[PDB]
Amino acid sequence: SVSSVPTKLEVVAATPTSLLISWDAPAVTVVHYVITYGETGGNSPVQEFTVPGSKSTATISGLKPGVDYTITVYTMYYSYSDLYSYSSPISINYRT
Amino acid sequence: SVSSVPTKLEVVAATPTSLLISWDAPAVTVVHYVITYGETGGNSPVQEFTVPGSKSTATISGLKPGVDYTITVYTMYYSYSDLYSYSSPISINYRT
Amino acid sequence: IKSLFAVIIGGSVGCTLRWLLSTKFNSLFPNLPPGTLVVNLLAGLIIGTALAYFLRQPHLDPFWKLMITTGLCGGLSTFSTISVEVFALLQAGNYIWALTSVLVHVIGSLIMTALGFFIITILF
Amino acid sequence: MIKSLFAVIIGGSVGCTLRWLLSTKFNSLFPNLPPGTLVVNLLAGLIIGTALAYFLRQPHLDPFWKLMITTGLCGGLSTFSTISVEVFALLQAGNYIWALTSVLVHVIGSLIMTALGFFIITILF
Ligand SMILES: CCCCCCCCCCO[C@@H]1O[C@H](CO)[C@@H](O[C@H]2O[C@H](CO)[C@@H](O)[C@H](O)[C@H]2O)[C@H](O)[C@H]1O
Ligand SMILES: CCCCCCCCCCO[C@@H]1O[C@H](CO)[C@@H](O[C@H]2O[C@H](CO)[C@@H](O)[C@H](O)[C@H]2O)[C@H](O)[C@H]1O
Ligand SMILES: CCCCCCCCCCO[C@@H]1O[C@H](CO)[C@@H](O[C@H]2O[C@H](CO)[C@@H](O)[C@H](O)[C@H]2O)[C@H](O)[C@H]1O
Ligand SMILES: [F-]
Ligand SMILES: [F-]
Ligand code: NA
């Protein structure tokens, strides 16, 4: 009925070794967002961390200059039917 | 299971034309007590009034001197099964 | 056993209503899901009117009032669903709507109980 | 949505039946805060808390079973209308202290049980 996936995931600001990302919250009670990031085309462990449900931006630090990263965001959310479950991800690529 | 009828109904104080009655509350949520009184002799109309559930005494005024009265007390009470219903009465006689 | 059928028939009707209304409307306003609210306001109203009505009709069969109160109102209303909605809001750091949801449910349900009771007592 | 209806009815009827038995058994024992009605709400709070944690970890569990446990069992077992009428009666009886206390014990108690069920299962897994 209602999507629990965030929309308009984008890099709003960048340095050679960090990215500020933002997204629009979905119309459900999000308890927290899970941000994942890793070097595109594999060959590097994907890392993840959470941000609280109220926040809709996040900083990713400690990246390497001139490298393509795959960045994804999903929610851990409350709905009536499923109680707590995890949304599908929304995903972008970005080269530092 | 639990009696909704008051106990130890008694005249605690009296004048020729009034009675102070008291009773012990039953172990249920009493919303109000209904006091009735009338002349024991013959067919004088029985009168009644309510007292709030928190009170366990009542004054009956405007009686006649030297006349036997029948006095009764019942509850309008909340229980789980019956919601609001009326208890059986407890009853005493007293001569002004 | 006759009493058990009252609880089951009433309860199943109430639970079914709560399911339909909640799955229909809860997603419309996630901070205070209105399906869950409406079922509690509605049960508050129904039991308020039952309170007043059954006082005035002392001889009504215990089967019907068991079906309406423990069954219908009991099935229709919910506390566990409020508890989990509020818990989620608390985990989400949304304290304002956690508190508001509790207050709107409690005060709202009591107002509806009062309204049902007093409409029927003012009607008699 | 007929298989789903049976989940709600089977779960709901079990819950409603439990609430009826527990309430008629124990409510008259302490009329200021009827403990049958409290226990069923604390118990449903606990169950749905554990469901919250458990379902998250088992995303592929049939929607029939979680509909039976949440909307059915917990929904039937718990009650708001019965609290509403108990409190209303206390308010009419001029017993404001226990009217307020009953509301607080039900709300805070149910939330504590939801938290406890959730955290026991998350601390377990
Ligand atoms: C401006 C126009 C309004 C409409 C007119 C209606 C007036 C009479 C009916 C409403 O009465 C209210 O509710 C109770 C009756 O339903 C009354 O309590 C009385 O009756 C109760 C039992 O019915 C007892 O518990 C109480 O002790 C006793 O005071 C109470 O005082 C009064 O507020
Ligand atoms: C009212 C009656 C009492 C009933 C009992 C209710 C129990 C409340 C459970 C709250 O759960 C916690 O809530 C925190 C805040 O809501 C969350 O912190 C999250 O959000 C915070 C800020 O939003 C961050 O600082 C944390 O690091 C982050 O984990 C945390 O995960 C979560 O487990
Ligand atoms: C939390 C917010 C939402 C709340 C919803 C509204 C619920 C309020 C119910 C009020 O009911 C009244 O309670 C009074 C007692 O509290 C009763 O007075 C009775 O008792 C009084 C003293 O206890 C006497 O002064 C009165 O005359 C006597 O009628 C009165 O009859 C009754 O109708
Ligand atoms: F609950
Ligand atoms: F309610
Ligand atoms: Na219920």
Author numbering:
A (entry chain D), B (entry chain C): 1 to 96
C (entry chain A): 2 to 125
D (entry chain B): 1 to 125
Question: What text appears in the publication on this structure?
Answer:
Bacterial Fluc channels assemble as dimers of small subunits (120–130 residues, 4 transmembrane helices) arranged in antiparallel transmembrane topology. The hourglass-shaped channel is complexed with two 'monobody' crystallization chaperones, which plug each of the wide vestibules facing the two aqueous solutions.
Moreover, the F− coordination shells are completed by conserved phenylalanine residues interacting edge-on with the bound anions, Phe80 associated with the F1− pair and Phe83 with the F2− pair. These four aromatic side chains adopt a striking side-to-face 'Phe-box' arrangement that supports an unusual aromatic-halide coordination motif proposed to be essential for F−-specific binding and permeation. Mutation of the conserved Phe-box residues in a Fluc homologue from B. pertussis was previously shown to severely inhibit F− transport, an effect presumed to reflect the replacement of F−-friendly binding sites in the conduction pathways with kinetic barriers to ion movement. This idea is now tested in Ec2, where we here examine occupancy of the F−-binding sites by solving crystal structures of Phe-box mutants F80I and F83I and assessing their transport function. Substitution of each aromatic side chain by Ile specifically extinguishes the corresponding pair of F− densities, one in each pore, while leaving the other pair Phe-coordinated and unperturbed. The mutations cause only local structural disturbances such as alternate rotamers at nearby sidechains Ser84 and Ser110 (Cα rmsd 0.4 Å, 0.2 Å for F80I, F83I). Functionally, the mutations are dramatic, reducing F− flux in reconstituted liposomes to undetectable levels, a >104-fold rate inhibition compared to the wildtype (WT) channel. Moreover, the F80I / F80I and F83I / F83I double mutants with identical Phe substitutions in both domains - mimics of the mutant homodimers above - are likewise inactive. However, the Phe-mutant crystal structures here, while validating F− coordination by the aromatic rings, refute the idea of a mutually stabilizing quartet, since the two Phe side chains remaining in each Ile substitution, though distant from each other, adopt identical orientations and crystallographic order as in the full Phe-box of WT (side chain rmsd 0.2 Å upon backbone alignment). The results also highlight the importance of the conserved Phe-box residues in crafting coordination spheres for which F− ions are willing to shed their extensive aqueous hydration shells and enter the water-depleted confines of the ion-conduction pathway.
